Structures are given as C-alpha cells and as structure tokens.
Amino acid sequence: ATLKVIGVGGGGNNAVNRMIDNVEFIAINTDGQALNLSKAESKIQIGEKLTRGLGAGANPEIGKKAAEESREQIEDAIQGADMVFVTSGMGGGTGTGAAPVVAKIAKEMGALTVGVVTRPFSFETQAAAGVEAMKAAVDTLIVIPNDRLLDIVDKSTPMMEAFKEADNVLRQGVQGISDLIAVSGEVNLDFADVKTIMSNQGSALMGIGVSSGENRAVEAAKKAISSPLLETSIVGAQGVLMNITGGESLSLFEAQEAADIVQDAADEDVNMIFGTVINPELQDEIVVTVIATGF
Template sequence: MSLSNDKPIMNISVIGIGDAGNKAIENISKENFQGIKLLYLNDNNELLANKDKDSTIFLNLKNEESINKNWNIGKIAANDSINEIKQKLIDTKLLILTAGFGGNIGTGALPVVAKTAKEMGILTIAIVTTPFSYEGTTKELNARVGLENLKGNADIVIVISNDRLINNYPDIAAIDAFKLVNNIVKNCVRTFVNLITKSSVINLSIIDLVNAIKDKGEAYIGFGSGIGRNKIMRAINGALNSKIIETSIKNSTNAILYIVGDPTVTMQQINEVITLFKQKVKNDQMNIVFGFDVNPNLRNEIQISIIATFDKTKIIENKLTNEQLLHNSQELLLEIGNTLENELNAYTTGELDIPRFDVEKMNYQYDDKDQESFLISNEEEDTEDDIPFFLK
C-alpha cells in the first residue's frame, strides 16, 4: 500500500506493550512513517535499554514472586507509571495500542493505558492478539479477562485470533505466522496514517474518522488487493474475508474504505469499489466514508483496506426487537395453554380415562402452606440455573 512521507493532520502515537507489542513496534519502525510517535512499554529493562529513552516506558514489577501467577501485575505496574504514560501522550490525538493478550504485561497494562488515553480525550484504537489454544486455558482465560477490562476503555478493539491463524494457515512456518500477525498490525497503522494524511488524493476529515470509530467497541479490519481485469472484485473479496480477525463484518453499521491504486485508476472505478462493497455487505443503510491515494509503483493493481464498526444504538434496537419477539412468543404460548385448558375442561375425567390417583391430584386444592413450599422450591431451582455451568 502507499505510504506517504507527509505528516498526518492529527498527532498519532503507537504504543507496543509487552514483548509481542514491542516486536510489532519494531516492525513498524522499519517503515518511513512521518510524524508518528512510536513507544515501547515493557518490564524488560534490557530490551528497553537499547531504545531511545524518549520512546520507552519502563514498568517496574515490584512483586516479582507473583509475576507468573497473576496477570494483574501488569495492571498494577501500569497504574504505578500512569504519570509517565500521561506525559508521553501529551498532544496525542489518535492512539493505537497493540499487545498480545494472555500473559501478564500486555493483558494487564493495555486496558489501563487505553482508559487513561480516553480520559485525556484521545481517540483510542486497540489491536490485540489472543493466544493459541495449545498455550493452555490459563492464558485463554487471562485473554478474555483482558478483553472484558478493555470494554469501554478503547473506542474500537481489533482482535487478531492466533487460533484462526493456525486453522486457516496450518502449513505456515512459525516464523512466518508471527510476521503475518505483525504485518496486520503494521497495515492497521498504515491505513489510519494514510487516511488522515494531507497528501492523499481524497482523505478523511477528522469528523468522519471520529464518527466512524468513536465508542464503537469490537471492530473488523481486512485488507485485499487485485491485479488485472477483475482486480476490484479480487480486492473487495480479500478485504471482506479476513481469516484471522475474530469479529465478523456482518451487521456492521459503519465502514471506512481506504483505496490505493495505480495512476490510471478512474473515479468510475472508485465508484465501482463502493458499489460492489455495498452489494457484498447487503446493507444499503451503512454509513460509508472513504479515502483514496495513488501509488506510482503499482501496475494495473488496486488495494483496499476496510475498517467496519458497529453502532451500539442499532445493537440495542435489535435487542429490543428480539425481546419483543420473545414477548409475542410468550403471549402465543399462553394463548395455546388457555385453549388447551378450555378443551380439557369440556371433558369429564371419566371420558379422558385418567387413573383415579391422577384425578385426585388434579382436584387437590393447594393451601397457603403448600403454595409457599412450592414457590420456594422453584426459586431454588431458578437460582441454580443462573449459575454458569463451569462453576457448578
């Protein structure tokens, strides 16, 4: 994809947290991003010692005995360094955070940094990876806790699934798998940088960017490219079918399209990209904004990045609709029950050939004490059903 040498129209910082996040930042640093602040946040002082002090934040893990037992140690260390984190984020308008979830540092510290940034009025994007299943249930549960803590503390969260990676690319070499994940992070950064760079032929306004990603929760991101006669179709299909992103694009309500083409790309072809995208997602009401740039190094090629988000008000409306459907279903069942009861009452017990002991049960009148006992029994059953199955 194209990579502009001009500064973006808003200050961007990218922070890699923990070993995985630091490696992603190292990968990004090899690109020619202008006006982007790259920061390393880690407890590994030896690793940080090789970096410029202005680009590092050292997390001091005071209780080293509990490091391997408690992911919360990263949260505590980040809170202890909160003033330094705030200082590093002064003048930042857009923050991209990345880390591997499941361990101690990234899982615990990233939600703290995200919350701090949001409180400072910074538009915040989190890109995190979830662990491989073979790494064990402890890491998987830690990752889920980290994602839960991240809710509401980042405007959008992009989750890269390592399990999806291994399932969809089973023959990929381990070293290439990690490169692929780091390249996804790099492409995310590149997309946001290029979207708001002055030199783009068509760039997003800050208002468009804010409306598309502010307070939207988990998001989808995909990249695709196409060469030749069917390049637009190939690029769209690739961007819509990301195989390692945990969130599906289905039911998304907002989309950012970033299009990069060779110098021969026409406005008609840009229109074709947007039209085809709408057809594929089958949502005429989706709010779509786009940016476009030319890369003179491309030959008969088009590249597309898609960032799709979800409008929480729409999700609430859908839930209300489902609740209404449930209410209607309950009313229908009640009506059926009343009809059956009326039909039953139309017959005598003799005609129904019901055994005498069952007839006695049907005719038995519960007194207040029996009714109270029955209600308590049912309350106990309902309470037990509310307990998650893994705690029973």
C-alpha cells in the same frame, strides 16, 4: 498528524521490535530486564515500587496497578499524539493488565486509541479476560493475526482513515451501533466466541481492506469481507455501512466498483449506507471499510 505505537509487556515489546526492523514507538514494561532488549527510542518501566522483590506468578492485576503508579510517566511519553496504537502482543504476563490502563490514559489525553490484539482467544479465559478489558478502554478494537502485524504500520495512513470512521460510527450511534469490533486478515475467530464480549444489541463487525494499483477498488472491497467473521455475518446482516476512501485518482465510478462487490455479498433487503471520500492525503492507495450489524 503524530502516530504512536505502544508495546506493553513481554508480547508487546516483541511486537514493537519486529515493527521497528513515520511512527514513534514506545515500550512499556513492569519487567526492566525486557526493557533492555527493546530497540524503542523511548522506554518506560512501570510500577517500580509495586514490583520490588516480586518473583514469578506476576498476574494482570499487578500490571494494571503498576501502570496506574507510573501514570505521569506514561502521560509524558504520549504527549502530543493524535492517534495511538496499543498492543500487548502474544503471551500473558503483566501487559495484559497494563495495556488497558495505557489505552485509557491516552484516551483522556484525547488521542484516538486503538487496541491491537494478536493473541488468540475464545469466549464460548485468561487471554479472553484481557481482550474484554482492552475493549472497554479503547475507542476501537481490532483483531488481526500476528503474522499480519506489520500491516498496521505498513498501511498506517489508510488504516488511520478506517479507525476514524469506526470512532465516528460508534459515537454517532449510526444505525443503532453501540459496540464495534474490527477485523483485518484471516482471523481464527467465530461469531459465537465474540458475541459474549459484545453487547446484547447494537453490536457491529468491521472489516478492512487496503489496496493499490490495478483493480484496486475491487481487491480492497474483497479483502474487507474476506475474513471468516465478516464472510459469515454480512450475509444475515440487516444493516451495512460501507465506506471507500481514496485520493484524487479515485472517481465515483471506481468507488462504485467496490460498492457493487459488497452489495452482492449482503442480502437483498439490507439497509446499506454507502459512502465515498476523496481525500488528497491518500495518494495512490484506497481503503474500504464494511460495517455489518443487525444479526
């Protein structure tokens, strides 16, 4: 399976470069100056015509249209990808507008598309606007802190299994879920300021944990419900979807070690679906996803 990490804009090119220091990287920008600082092997300047003689003040809309203009070139850089990771990293600029369009393009190619947001936002507004557009355009949105960025590439295969699970849940509409946001690590986010992006009903929150070695099942399950969002939400949650995936060394009894951690954290009357996959391509790592819904 081919994975592609796409960095869009000032922040995204800076995101890609830190990650570069088994994944193809692609750097997209309306600003060709920034494109020369990229160590990406494949770089794409978008909106050459639209941006001629432009100066400061470049907004999201410029970048959105710019990406539509260079659509074919974006398609040729994504050709053959099974999964795609798109980020516009920190900061503003044109990437905020372009990154959704890039995501939308890869989806119509049929790649599983994941939006990575590291830029702080709150909804209780320019950054926040960008987050909403990304979320309409991707299969799954994951919010993660910037200092934890390297995890999405360091544990890309476990996190691959997590986003497939999220894409499956969101399309089947399991337990009525119609809208889903994923979280990794300690995020500065509050339910209040996320409930606005998400649906009036059927919204869900997914935590992820990946771990290996001694006590791995329990530490993954712990990591999964550790971020503020999950910690608060899983308590009142009416439904919980739990999944642990591992390779041949995982046994049902180890899996159950994780399921117990989560079940102790959800309240007593929860409707909890617990799944366990043994998947050889995982080797020695395990991934725990905990999906909460029904707030």
